[PDB]
Design a protein around this ligand. Structure first.
Ligand SMILES: [Mg+2]
Lengths: 108, 54, 114, 54, 46, 80, 53
RNA sequence: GUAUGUCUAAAUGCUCUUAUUUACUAACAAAAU
RNA sequence: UAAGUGAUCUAGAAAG
């Protein structure tokens, strides 16, 4: 999954990454980061100018650069790091979400 | 018949040439653009260049 | 054949990644590269006395030392090194550490600074 | 050259850098060049500029 | 030439290394300050 | 190099000062009397209008006086 | 990346299979010669244009 | 200009980490407005 | 009555 949470409205824009993405690949972690960045960019594009963010906050330290690269089209949107080891890694601990993740036959 | 994609690494220019079928070319162009914006390897290269130049 | 040589010859079958992998596989087995106290040439900044035979090795005197990494770093992400030397007369292993808090060195059971 | 009373440009005075000065300049240039097998191109350039400006 | 050590990485008296060290301290120091203040606040509250 | 051909109450701020400057330059280059002679030689109605024209030349004279010059007085005398 | 793109848009452009050829490692940096990296089989017969940009 | 010298009897595949370097060499050269 | 034609050095490799 790519857990993308709006903390104002509670809109979890959950992109489900499928097993078919990782087929016959290498340098996998790096690839994943890039993929995530791409997804984020797509999401941003989808959102209209009123609903678009200001600060896209990132949980991990090394998700900045790729995101930045992908978000050169949207320079108004800043990309923010954080000292907080936020608990959004426990999105899969939530049941319904987990179920949804399990039951996916495509990128969704 | 085919196509020769080409990416000038030192100028970051890209272009391709060859044979095309209906609806392909725009898509291809888009893909190329995407790659230029963000391919991991290309990004790495850019970073390296920056480092070299400071 | 000449120090500024642009391109080293490779065999006609040289999968570079594969080659690298092979090397790695034969790096654990390897004698050198899989060891500590890799050599170095260094002048002595401390200007100190060899504790065994009292040989007064002065400042800037050149030696073929051994640089080794000290696992316990300074603070977090700035390494410190043990720099082994031998006294000219008696073959006692002098060494020193580079603690960068003071922008200077520390003696390590070799000799004494004066 | 001007007459202070009448304010007339009454005479001319043609100038030329005396040969000694030229020689000195040349020497300076040589100095800049010599003892510069290392130097950061930029430093050399700066030196040259300084010389030239002087 | 004279002093060799000056053309070594490991040499701490080399300027680059010193700069790096300073940077490390500066970041770490800042962090400490951030935390230190918090600690102080907590103490006050207590 | 140029021929002295020049086209000159209302027209007096920047323009007047420019004119003054020009005159000064001329003086520097030539020599006063010589310069005057040269001026006379060309038609020159604008710089020095000869005809009195009901105290209109007074202004010109005043201007000339402001930047050390001759012949103005003579001109004034001529007209009365 | 190209391969991925092709995969994404298979049935849209009538593509049977997108075969990435097993080229010699140095093919990237053989500037004299070249080789087809991504061979591309069609389902129906493509009516291609002349060599163009 | 990357010094040198002595010394010599005749486990297998696997993958994952990188926007770096325990990197080494100093023979080479050395100034200001 | 008459301006404005032409002159164009170079050019890298080793070792130290
Ligand atoms: Mg020699």
């Amino acid at each position: 999954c790519i857990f993308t949470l709006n903390p104002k409205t509670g809109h979890l824009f959950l992109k489900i990454i499928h097993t078919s993405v990782w087929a016959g690949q290498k340098r996998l972690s790096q690839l994943a980061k890039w993929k995530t960045a791409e997804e984020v960019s797509a999401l941003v594009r989808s959102l209209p100018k009123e609903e678009q963010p200001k600060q896209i906050i990132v949980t991990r330290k090394a998700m900045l650069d790729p995101l930045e690269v992908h978000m050169l089209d949207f320079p108004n949107i800043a990309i923010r790091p954080t000292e907080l080891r936020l608990p959004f890694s426990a999105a899969m601990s939530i049941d319904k979400l987990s179920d949804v993740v399990m039951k996916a036959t495509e990128p969704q | 018949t085919g196509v020769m994609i080409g990416i000038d690494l030192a100028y970051n220019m890209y272009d391709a040439y060859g044979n095309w079928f209906n609806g392909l070319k725009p898509l291809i162009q888009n893909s190329m653009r995407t790659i230029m914006k963000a391919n991991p390897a290309l990004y790495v290269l850019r970073e390296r260049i920056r480092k070299g130049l400071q | 054949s000449e120090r500024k040589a642009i391109n080293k010859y490779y065999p006609p079958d040289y999968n570079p990644l594969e080659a690298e992998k092979l090397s790695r596989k034969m790096a654990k087995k390897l004698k050198t590269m899989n060891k500590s106290h890799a050599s170095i040439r260094l002048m002595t900044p401390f200007s100190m006395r060899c504790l065994e035979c009292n040989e007064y090795i002065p400042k800037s005197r050149k030696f073929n030392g051994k640089k080794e990494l000290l696992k316990e770093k300074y603070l977090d992400s700035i390494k410190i090194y043990r720099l082994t030397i031998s006294c000219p007369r008696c073959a006692n292993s002098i060494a020193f550490r580079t603690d960068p808090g003071n922008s200077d060195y520390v003696m390590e059971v070799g000799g004494v600074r004066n | 050259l001007v007459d202070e009373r009448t304010k007339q440009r009454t005479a001319k005075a043609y100038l030329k850098v005396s040969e000694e000065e030229i020689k000195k300049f040349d020497s300076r240039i040589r100095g800049i060049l010599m003892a510069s097998g290392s130097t950061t191109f930029t430093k050399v350039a700066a030196k040259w500029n300084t010389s030239l400006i002087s | 030439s004279g002093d060799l050590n000056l053309l070594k990485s490991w040499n701490p008296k080399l300027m680059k290394n010193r700069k790096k060290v300073w940077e490390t301290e500066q970041d770490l120091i800042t962090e400490q300050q951030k935390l230190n203040t918090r600690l102080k606040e907590i103490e006050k509250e207590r | 190099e140029f021929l002295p051909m020049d086209c000159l109450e209302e027209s007096c701020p920047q323009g007047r000062i420019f004119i003054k400057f020009l005159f000064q330059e001329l003086v520097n280059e030539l020599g006063l009397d010589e310069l005057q002679l040269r001026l006379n030689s060309s038609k020159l109605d604008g710089m020095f209008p000869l005809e009195g024209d009901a105290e209109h030349i007074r202004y010109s004279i005043n201007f000339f006086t402001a930047i050390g010059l001759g012949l103005l007085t003579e001109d004034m005398r001529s007209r009365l | 990346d190209i391969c991925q793109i092709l995969d994404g848009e298979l049935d849209v452009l009538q593509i049977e299979s997108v075969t990435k050829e097993t080229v010699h490692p140095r093919k990237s940096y053989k500037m004299n010669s070249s080789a087809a990296d991504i061979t591309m089989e069609s389902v129906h017969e493509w009516e291609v244009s002349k060599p163009s940009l």
